[PDB]
Design a binder for these strands. Structure first.
Ligand SMILES: [Mg+2]
Ligand SMILES: [Mg+2]
Ligand SMILES: [Mg+2]
Lengths: 284, 442, 442, 284
DNA sequence: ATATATGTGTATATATACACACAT
DNA sequence: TGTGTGTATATATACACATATATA
């Protein structure tokens, strides 16, 4: 029951809820008026997030922002965030001309919505029963649109959309620091539940048409191709009009974050207490 | 060491009184003609200074502040930032005088973003209503670059709602609809019975009524079924936080109601489910009274109309329409002063243009041979002690493309146009000019 | 609703890498030539913008740091205010680039007043060293109103002393005396053995001893008669608060020392008396070592010279002499660029003045007649004839008073002296002009 | 043991120690460099002082810069700041042509310095012995140049000279509030122990010489009487001054506060719940 | 017979990142 | 192992003033 939490009306219920982690109170004021009012949350952090890499959970749950993230979403350190259903019969079907191997208790990402295997079976879709020993696990785990259904959860929410500013600090010192903090629950990344809302950094309008560039590097690659324009570099999320805020909230461009096999070394390189790794990484 | 003896009576009568009266005339109590407290006047003056180059450009709210220090605002820039952030909204202002770019706050959360994100510019309302900026009175102190008070066409003080607080005095004026204020000002101009302005809060969909001089602000609620209700509106004094934490947290903790949130684009939309522990007597009047009482949908406020008159002294009004019947009268004299100033300026410009045309004709006709003489004696020569001897330096500084016949007739045309403008300004009255300036406000 | 799967490797390689390179280049590490982190050059650009009209006018620190986002600053103005407060003082600046009136802190209290109070302006040192501001490189971004880096004459980065931390890299350059940095630049310019410069701290009266890269900044003391002593100077690291609370407080509540404060106008004056419980003895060497160690009168600093070269890339040097040689090599080319630009500008101005002189001479007598003409025919006539077409603006910029006497002689003299000025620019080389400019620094 | 306090070397001992209460760290930065290291203290307040009229001596010590002042000056609420010497033999002398009646253990303010009665007697000054019953107590109480010698006391500093920003807020809102606080000991304003360190509010540089105006009211009485003045309005007490601070501290212009008979009425009118008395006060 | 909120003003203060070399 | 420097991210506290409502 933290102070600055915009609770969704189906928080503690089984629904496709989302929690938005803006980094300040100035980024939240326009979110209230543009939520889904049913599956949307909000909590303002306080600037640069504490470097969560390497500290024990006792010291980890001492910063106010990390403690409130834990209290809101229900994630507790040192314990997992959700258990999966027991493996059963494996079924293979052809979705959009692509062979897909799932179980009888999996979730399928179709048109931005997760549909149960039972629902697809009830939708007059052909299913091929395949023995478990004759199932390619490597191909099964490579499908980003397939995830296992949870038996039980404590994560009040079902999605944590990190929505920070697009300044270099917001994308470089705060985004891949909340990423490092949430790396303590790799199941969140495996299920495609940790997302980043693509907030434009530069809204360069030409004539009567507005173009959105989500990174400064994207702008510099199209600075000489677009017509004459007035660059509007938004420093923070609170510098966006209500119309643009509502458009980018109700028509979001997420970035579902997944970890590679060597994510631990990648996070140690950027967050660990060894400047030589950063020196080598930067000069390349 | 210059040990001197000082009495407490002299300290209070001089230093404590100076601050206490300064707080009245500067910290609060907005000027009746201006509608601005001094901080807001400084902010708008700086915003005009910034927008001089380009009025459509949005400037950082930090840029609007900070530079207010040189204009004569020696009171710290955070207050200037905060006062400029409260003027660019539309939820707070029924007639905003600054336009905004960014999260300037909403009715749900009534706090703007930090000054580092949000931009501000002088809105089209200021340019549409505020006229005669150059004819505004000059402040007594030389360091106060902004004028004593601007000159809006209508009394902006009864447009957005002010709440000032001072040592000994305080003010509280409720917002009024722009159309009603305009109608009242027009009636005062024509000199008939003036209808009192109607109170209308910005971005408010409810009912405001007059009861024995008070002002009861009521929300609106409907019952979708026997046990479900929809709070379509809440009184203007409430945010989403100070309404929830004041009316819905106590009710939920006591186990009376179970409320949901629907504060979407349609303002506040709380949906309330009633339990059996809450009284639901079938009497319509009693049920309505109970709902209005427990849910705080009724808010009573009374105007305390304390302003600063045109003479820079505190004045307290009683009727809602008593600023209008005095603001209109003083603004009439100010429009008359504008008319006289414009007449003088147009006469001077026409005389200068006519003398310029005459000098051009005389110099192209060989009467004044420019070649073969020094500049000093030529200035002392026939260009002096004649009809255009007052503007000898201006004529001497003439550029080249005027000896040619392309502009030789153009200068005469401009002189004739200036004479026609002067005749127009002489053939006008203060009432006609003021009622013409009012038609601009749509 | 879009769900694009992003690998963490791409996140780290793009967003984190961009942030790290940004911190290294455009936030923390100072430019080799300019010696400015890219928040100090924004402040100086804005202060120069404010100093256009009145050079000596003092501007509030909320006005300098305010409105730097229009120059291209992409961060909060509080950081700009803090950066402008550090370079506007004298206690830690061996070459103040900003002159300010107010409490900018001192060695005792190393914290300037709140930005609402202290004023600042560009000092005479900046105008004395920073030349060719208009010939400075144009930054790639169009929004970066300031140049890519200003063009000083001596390496400013070695004078004031710069310490910055970024992702993966960090810098620390000790202050160096101006009198010796100028000598080193002179030796580099002529070409000879470059003497290493001497590290000099601002408003510091002690001894800086260098052994090998390490520096051994010491303090001072003086035994009055046998046990009472006067600490006349503490190392540069200490404040007054974090010297009392660091050494003198954890020495009085231990039965070791008793101290009094005598921090006069000269500097620190912590007069100390020792009680019986002390390990002091007769031997001078151990006495001196124990006094210097216990009271922290010795501080050690080792330079880590990390600077951004003229190409915008990080560069780490091994000694200051290498930095001076590289800086003078870079500035020698910009001196030649100034020479070429001045040559072109002077040639164009000479041609303009000669065309003006020919126009005055040929219209006063009456060859080129403008009477009974229009703009189009006059312009066509002047463009058809040679040596007049490229500067048809001269036709209209002459003004009427230039069709007289006492001006043809003046304009001809101006045109003649322009030839002398162009010849002056066509003979001087880089070395002599650079030496002449260096001779004006004192 | 106050962190923010600049203790004087002779603070707590028997001397003419002085406290220099400012209203911010920005105004006290230059004090340490310019103050008399022997007898000069300093404690910066935090903005406006709490309205301390009618409050009990238990909520008064809840404001930080009203309990800290008590800690520094050693004063405690509800107890006399010091016990005066017992009355003895009374003496009269002609001081600068004025007949002054004193007692053998008072102090006399001569040329800005306080001198003991015994010292004056030892300085070849004629003293006339007068019986105690024949001494006019009304005349003695009216003498502002004579103060009783302190037999014992706790006031660490025997001066509480208040110095604040010379603007309206620091002159009419903080000065009288501190006066009302210090009125809890209605004996400090009896020996000239509460002083006001006058500070310029407006500085003009007519010619090559520097002219100081202490109050804006004083400035707006000869503003159209000076040649070519370009004022530098001073809002910060010690934050718009560089060497003027040293001049105004080493050559201070004090103003001792003396309570009239009806000081309680004035403090209730200026600092009281009834706001109608103020409206009656500023209307005349 | 208290509690409180409104909007200019008075001052300050907080947590966090980054690295490198003293100082433990 | 640990403060410490300077540019960045974001946030926050007490105090005054009065008067008309809500509460006690
Ligand atoms: Mg934000
Ligand atoms: Mg101050
Ligand atoms: Mg003050």
């Amino acid at each position: 029951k933290v102070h600055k939490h915009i609770k969704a009306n189906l928080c503690g219920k089984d629904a496709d809820t989302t929690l938005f982690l803006t980094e300040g109170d100035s980024a939240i004021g326009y979110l209230i008026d543009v939520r889904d009012k049913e599956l949307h949350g909000g909590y303002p952090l306080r600037g640069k997030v504490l470097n969560s890499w390497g500290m024990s959970y006792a010291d980890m749950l001492k910063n106010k922002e990390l403690f409130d993230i834990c209290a809101i979403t229900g994630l507790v350190l040192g314990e997992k965030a959700f258990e999966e259903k027991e493996d059963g019969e494996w079924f293979t079907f052809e979705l959009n001309g692509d062979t897909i191997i799932v179980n009888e208790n999996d979730e399928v990402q179709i048109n931005g919505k997760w549909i149960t295997v039972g629902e697809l079976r009830k939708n007059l879709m052909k299913f091929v029963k395949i023995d478990s020993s004759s199932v390619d696990m490597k191909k099964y785990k490579l499908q980003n649109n397939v995830r296992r259904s949870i038996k039980s959860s404590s994560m009040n929410y079902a999605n944590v959309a990190i929505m920070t500013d697009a300044d270099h600090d917001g994308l470089g010192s705060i985004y891949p620091s909340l990423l490092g903090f949430f790396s303590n629950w790799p199941e969140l990344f495996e299920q495609g539940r940790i997302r980043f809302v693509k907030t434009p950094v530069i809204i360069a309008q030409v004539g009567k048409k507005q173009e959105w560039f989500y990174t400064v590097a994207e702008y510099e690659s199209a600075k000489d191709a677009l017509p004459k324009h007035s660059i509007r570099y938004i420093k923070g999320l609170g510098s966006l009009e209500k119309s643009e805020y509502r458009e980018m909230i109700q028509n979001p461009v997420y970035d579902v974050v997944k970890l590679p096999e060597n994510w631990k070394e990648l996070f140690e390189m950027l967050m660990g207490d060894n400047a030589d790794l950063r020196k080598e990484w930067m000069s390349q | 060491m210059q040990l001197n003896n000082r009495d407490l009576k002299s300290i209070i009568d001089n230093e404590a009184l100076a601050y206490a009266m300064y707080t009245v005339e500067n910290r609060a109590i907005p000027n009746m003609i201006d509608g601005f407290k001094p901080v807001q006047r400084f902010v708008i003056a700086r915003a005009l200074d910034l927008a001089r180059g380009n009025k459509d450009k949005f400037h950082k709210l930090a840029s609007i502040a900070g530079g207010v220090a040189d204009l004569g605002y020696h009171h710290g820039e955070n207050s200037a930032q905060d006062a400029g952030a409260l003027m660019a909204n539309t939820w707070n202002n029924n007639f905003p005088l600054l336009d905004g770019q960014g999260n300037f706050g909403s009715r749900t959360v009534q706090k703007a973003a930090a000054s580092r994100y949000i931009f501000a510019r002088v809105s089209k309302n200021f340019y549409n209503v505020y006229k005669d900026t150059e004819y505004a009175p000059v402040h007594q102190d030389k360091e106060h670059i902004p004028p004593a008070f601007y000159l809006p066409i209508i009394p902006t003080v009864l447009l957005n709602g002010v709440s000032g607080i001072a040592t000994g005095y305080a003010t509280y004026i409720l917002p009024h609809s722009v159309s009603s204020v305009k109608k009242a000002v027009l009636q005062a101009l024509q000199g008939k019975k003036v209808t009192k302005p109607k109170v209308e809060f910005p971005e408010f969909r409810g009912e405001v009524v007059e009861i024995d001089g008070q002002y009861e602000i009521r929300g609106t609620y409907k019952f979708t079924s026997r046990t479900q209700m929809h709070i379509t509106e809440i009184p203007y004094k409430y945010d989403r936080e100070t309404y929830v934490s004041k009316i819905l947290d106590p009710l939920e903790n006591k186990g009376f109601i179970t409320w949901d949130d629907a504060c979407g684009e349609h303002g506040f939309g709380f949906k309330v489910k009633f339990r059996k522990e809450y009284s639901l007597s079938d009497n319509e009047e009693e049920r309505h009274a109970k709902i209005m009482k427990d849910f705080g949908l009724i808010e009573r406020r009374s105007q305390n109309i304390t302003v600063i008159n045109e003479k820079g002294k505190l004045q307290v009004y009683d009727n809602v329409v008593d600023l209008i019947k005095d603001f209109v009268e003083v603004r009439k004299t100010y429009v008359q002063k504008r008319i006289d100033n414009k007449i003088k300026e147009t006469e001077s410009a026409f005389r200068l243009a006519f003398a310029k045309a005459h000098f051009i004709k005389k110099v192209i006709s060989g009467e004044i041979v420019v070649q073969g003489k020094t500049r000093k004696e030529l200035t002392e020569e026939l260009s002096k002690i004649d009809m255009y001897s007052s503007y000898v330096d201006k004529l001497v500084g003439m550029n080249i493309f005027h000896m040619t016949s392309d502009e030789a007739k153009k200068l005469a045309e401009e002189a004739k146009a200036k004479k026609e403008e002067n005749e127009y300004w002489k053939t006008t009255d203060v009432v006609t000019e003021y009622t013409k300036d009012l038609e601009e406000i749509k």
